[PDB]
Scaffold this active site. Structure first.
Site, PDB file in Angstrom:
ATOM      1  N   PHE A 140       7.760  -1.190  -5.993  1.00  0.00           N
ATOM      2  CA  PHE A 140       6.357  -0.964  -6.324  1.00  0.00           C
ATOM      3  C   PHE A 140       6.321   0.096  -7.420  1.00  0.00           C
ATOM      4  O   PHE A 140       6.995   1.129  -7.294  1.00  0.00           O
ATOM      5  CB  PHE A 140       5.576  -0.500  -5.079  1.00  0.00           C
ATOM      6  N   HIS A 146       2.107   4.909  -9.517  1.00  0.00           N
ATOM      7  CA  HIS A 146       0.674   4.888  -9.281  1.00  0.00           C
ATOM      8  C   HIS A 146       0.305   6.229  -8.682  1.00  0.00           C
ATOM      9  O   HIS A 146       1.169   6.993  -8.235  1.00  0.00           O
ATOM     10  CB  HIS A 146       0.283   3.788  -8.279  1.00  0.00           C
ATOM     11  N   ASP A 199      -2.464   7.566  -5.615  1.00  0.00           N
ATOM     12  CA  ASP A 199      -3.115   6.966  -4.457  1.00  0.00           C
ATOM     13  C   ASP A 199      -4.621   6.934  -4.630  1.00  0.00           C
ATOM     14  O   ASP A 199      -5.226   7.868  -5.172  1.00  0.00           O
ATOM     15  CB  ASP A 199      -2.773   7.708  -3.162  1.00  0.00           C
ATOM     16  N   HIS A 203       3.816   8.430  -8.043  1.00  0.00           N
ATOM     17  CA  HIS A 203       5.003   8.104  -7.271  1.00  0.00           C
ATOM     18  C   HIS A 203       5.246   6.599  -7.323  1.00  0.00           C
ATOM     19  O   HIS A 203       4.385   5.819  -7.748  1.00  0.00           O
ATOM     20  CB  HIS A 203       4.874   8.613  -5.835  1.00  0.00           C
TER      21      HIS A 203
HETATM   22  C1  LIG Z   1       3.488   3.948  -1.285  1.00  0.00           C
HETATM   23  C2  LIG Z   1       3.312   3.388   0.115  1.00  0.00           C
HETATM   24  C3  LIG Z   1       2.159   4.101   0.838  1.00  0.00           C
HETATM   25  C4  LIG Z   1       3.121   1.847   0.099  1.00  0.00           C
HETATM   26  N1  LIG Z   1       2.193   1.420  -0.934  1.00  0.00           N
HETATM   27  C5  LIG Z   1       0.878   1.342  -0.711  1.00  0.00           C
HETATM   28  O1  LIG Z   1       0.376   1.507   0.405  1.00  0.00           O
HETATM   29  C6  LIG Z   1      -0.003   1.100  -1.935  1.00  0.00           C
HETATM   30  C7  LIG Z   1       0.191   2.272  -2.884  1.00  0.00           C
HETATM   31  S1  LIG Z   1      -0.398   3.841  -2.194  1.00  0.00           S
HETATM   32  N2  LIG Z   1      -1.397   1.037  -1.532  1.00  0.00           N
HETATM   33  C8  LIG Z   1      -2.151  -0.037  -1.756  1.00  0.00           C
HETATM   34  O2  LIG Z   1      -1.696  -1.092  -2.178  1.00  0.00           O
HETATM   35  C9  LIG Z   1      -3.606   0.108  -1.419  1.00  0.00           C
HETATM   36  C10 LIG Z   1      -3.940  -0.589  -0.115  1.00  0.00           C
HETATM   37  C11 LIG Z   1      -5.421  -0.486   0.211  1.00  0.00           C
HETATM   38  C12 LIG Z   1      -5.808  -1.266   1.465  1.00  0.00           C
HETATM   39  N3  LIG Z   1      -5.574  -2.720   1.310  1.00  0.00           N
HETATM   40  C13 LIG Z   1      -7.271  -1.019   1.752  1.00  0.00           C
HETATM   41  O3  LIG Z   1      -8.075  -1.895   1.661  1.00  0.00           O
HETATM   42  O4  LIG Z   1      -7.550   0.208   2.099  1.00  0.00           O
HETATM   43  C14 LIG Z   1       4.443   1.125  -0.092  1.00  0.00           C
HETATM   44  O5  LIG Z   1       5.361   1.482   0.760  1.00  0.00           O
HETATM   45  O6  LIG Z   1       4.598   0.271  -0.955  1.00  0.00           O
HETATM   46 FE   LIG Z   2       0.966   5.551  -3.004  1.00  0.00          FE
END
Ligand SMILES: CC(C)[C@@H](NC(=O)[C@H](CS)NC(=O)CCC[C@H](N)C(=O)O)C(=O)O
Ligand SMILES: [Fe+3]
Length: 329
Positions: free
Chosen positions: A209, A212, A214, A268
């Site tokens: 990933f 980005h 958060d 991150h």
């Molecule tokens: C970085 C981690 C937290 C994780 N990535 C993630 O959780 C990534 C980046 S923070 N987050 C997202 O895609 C947003 C999800 C939002 C969720 N559908 C909602 O409606 O609230 C990973 O392990 O890939």
């Molecule tokens: Fe994140």
């Protein structure tokens, strides 16, 4: 050469108590971490994270392809136009390894006025059949409130750290309206691991990933014991150590907005690692109409010219932009 980030372990237990000076000493530690690379591990948090991991694994490892379509978000199933956030996010064998299940505030029911009004970002959670997944919904809902409780205490620490009264953020974080979400992410072991599911960073690093910030006020993350996260610094990306006993805490971009970047949202990314593991974030979001007045703790008068931002618009825009930039998960 890849360096290692300093990620302090902060005993957050005073934030649950009434020893105000001890709370201030926690707040100082949160301040120092937030002004450095952002991340810290909250320890002595009171949540049974072993049960969280066990119950999550049992769900991930038993849900069938049929159940995944039946719970799928609109990105995977056109029949489910109301599921923009909550539901199952499917893997695509040969192309996409990650899969996940997202759920929202359990108080979002057909009775809730935001559901009746059809306000964006509010949805009624979907759940698998109870008899096929005994105890899962009850576990998941209990966990939402357990981590809500931890997050409320962490928000008191962040408020004190910024020179505010302890409820400055937490007053906006309420069970009746929070847009907070839990995501139960599975990252699989795969042999062979398909290269199509691996991204290459500008610096050559293989990623699952990309970089980005958060979309959150703060993010309260459990992960199993497989190192994968990296934080950007001016001297490049640094590895964040894994710790499957604590919660990794960071600020999201709403915090950076309201503090005039004094507490930045750390950039991150997720390294590619061929290992079965879990990533279980709780995104601490406020209510749809929550507005926090921005300030700048670097100025003597604390004044910021940044415009107050409504949380719901921030969340709607932010979740779309993250999909556009970093792909539908
Ligand atoms: C970085 C981690 C937290 C994780 N990535 C993630 O959780 C990534 C980046 S923070 N987050 C997202 O895609 C947003 C999800 C939002 C969720 N559908 C909602 O409606 O609230 C990973 O392990 O890939
Ligand atoms: Fe994140």
């Amino acid at each position: 050469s890849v360096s290692k980030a300093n990620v302090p372990k902060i005993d957050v237990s005073p934030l649950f108590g009434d020893d105000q000076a001890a709370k201030m000493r926690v707040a100082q530690q949160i301040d120092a971490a937030s002004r450095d690379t952002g991340f810290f591990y909250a320890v002595n948090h009171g949540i049974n994270v072993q049960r969280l991991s066990q119950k999550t694994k049992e769900f991930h490892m038993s849900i069938t392809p049929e159940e995944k379509w039946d719970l799928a978000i609109r990105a995977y199933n056109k029949e489910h136009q109301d599921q923009v956030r909550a539901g199952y996010y499917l893997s695509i064998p040969g192309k996409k390894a990650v899969e996940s299940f997202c759920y929202l505030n359990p108080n979002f029911t057909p009775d809730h006025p935001r559901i009746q009004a059809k306000t964006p970002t509010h949805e009624v959670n979907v759940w698998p059949d109870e008899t096929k997944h005994p105890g899962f919904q009850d576990f998941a809902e209990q966990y939402y409130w357990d981590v809500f409780g931890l997050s409320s205490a962490l928000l008191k620490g962040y408020a004190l750290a910024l020179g505010k009264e302890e409820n400055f953020f937490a007053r906006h974080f309420k069970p009746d309206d929070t847009l907070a979400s839990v995501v139960l992410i599975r990252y699989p072991y795969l042999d062979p691991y398909p290269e199509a599911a691996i991204k290459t960073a500008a610096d050559g690093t293989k990623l699952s990933f990309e970089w980005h910030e958060d979309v959150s006020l703060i993010t309260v993350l459990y992960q199993s014991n497989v190192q994968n996260l990296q934080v950007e610094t001016a001297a490049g990306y640094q590895d964040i150590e894994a710790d499957d006993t604590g919660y990794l805490i960071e600020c999201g971009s709403y915090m950076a907005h309201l503090t005039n970047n004094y507490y930045k949202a750390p950039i991150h990314r997720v390294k590619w690692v061929n290992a079965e593991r879990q990533s279980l974030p709780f995104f601490v979001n406020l209510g749809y109409d929550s507005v926090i007045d921005p300030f700048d703790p670097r100025e003597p008068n604390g004044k910021s010219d940044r415009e107050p931002l409504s949380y719901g618009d921030y969340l709607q825009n932010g979740l779309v932009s993250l999909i556009n930039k970093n792909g539908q998960t």
